[PDB]
């Protein structure tokens, strides 16, 4: 199919130019299914924690975004308990020129600085807004108890 060649280009680009702190690939024989791992940036309270997530590619691609969901738990206002994520690139402003590598870089930038505009989990959002230290050590506790 037409999307198959574009995915071939994506996988070739990922192989020849692996990203830094993110690594992704097909867990199974089926090419549409995908999975990824992201390591927290150095300038973040997520040191030593790895986040694993799964992606489902629609049969009609690249004009429609794929479904991305974490399998691991973490303390973050945009990250839901079940792994639900809210980002404008993901659903609002998805474009054909966008690449999976680009959205992974956007996710890494989100990890660098949480988005306080429309967080998915707002209680921890106002907890973070109350003071930085509370969010810091609760994130450290979460990433050392489950993500590690």
């Amino acid at each position: 199919h037409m999307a198959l060649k574009r995915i071939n280009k994506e996988l070739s680009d990922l192989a020849r130019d692996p990203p830094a702190q993110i690594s992704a690939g097909p867990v199974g024989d089926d090419m549409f299914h995908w999975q990824a791992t992201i390591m927290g940036p150095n300038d973040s309270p997520y040191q030593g924690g790895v986040f694993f997530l799964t992606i489902h590619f629609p049969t009609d691609y690249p004009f429609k975004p794929p479904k991305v969901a974490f399998t691991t738990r973490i303390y973050h206002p945009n990250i839901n308990s079940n792994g639900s994520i809210c980002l404008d690139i993901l659903r609002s402003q998805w474009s054909p020129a966008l690449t999976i590598s680009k959205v992974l870089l956007s996710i890494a930038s989100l990890l660098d600085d949480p988005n306080p505009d429309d967080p998915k989990v707002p209680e921890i959002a106002r907890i973070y807004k109350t003071d930085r230290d509370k969010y810091n050590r609760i994130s450290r506790e979460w990433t050392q108890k489950y993500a590690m």
Binding site: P18, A20, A24, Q35, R140
Partner: protein
């Protein structure tokens, strides 16, 4: 069979191994060549976590593959 692995510090190190090597053998070689304790090392290939029980050939690994290393610091 030469491969490359990059760590969190941005340095790439060279590993001369064979596809039949166990993951525990790989971690032992990494510890020997770096001094890092094995318990602080986590190995990821294309998002797939590596377990010491299995081997390299179980992931369909070809030549000059680039890997990622994660430091599991015991304490934070």
């Amino acid at each position: 069979m030469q491969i490359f692995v990059k760590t969190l510090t941005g340095k790439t190190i060279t590993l001369e191994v064979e596809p039949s090597d166990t993951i525990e053998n790989v971690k032992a070689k990494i510890q020997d060549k770096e001094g890092i304790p094995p318990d602080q090392q986590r190995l990821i290939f294309a998002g797939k976590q590596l377990e010491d029980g299995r081997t390299l050939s179980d992931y369909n690994i070809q030549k000059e593959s680039t890997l990622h290393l994660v430091l599991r610091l015991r304490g934070g």
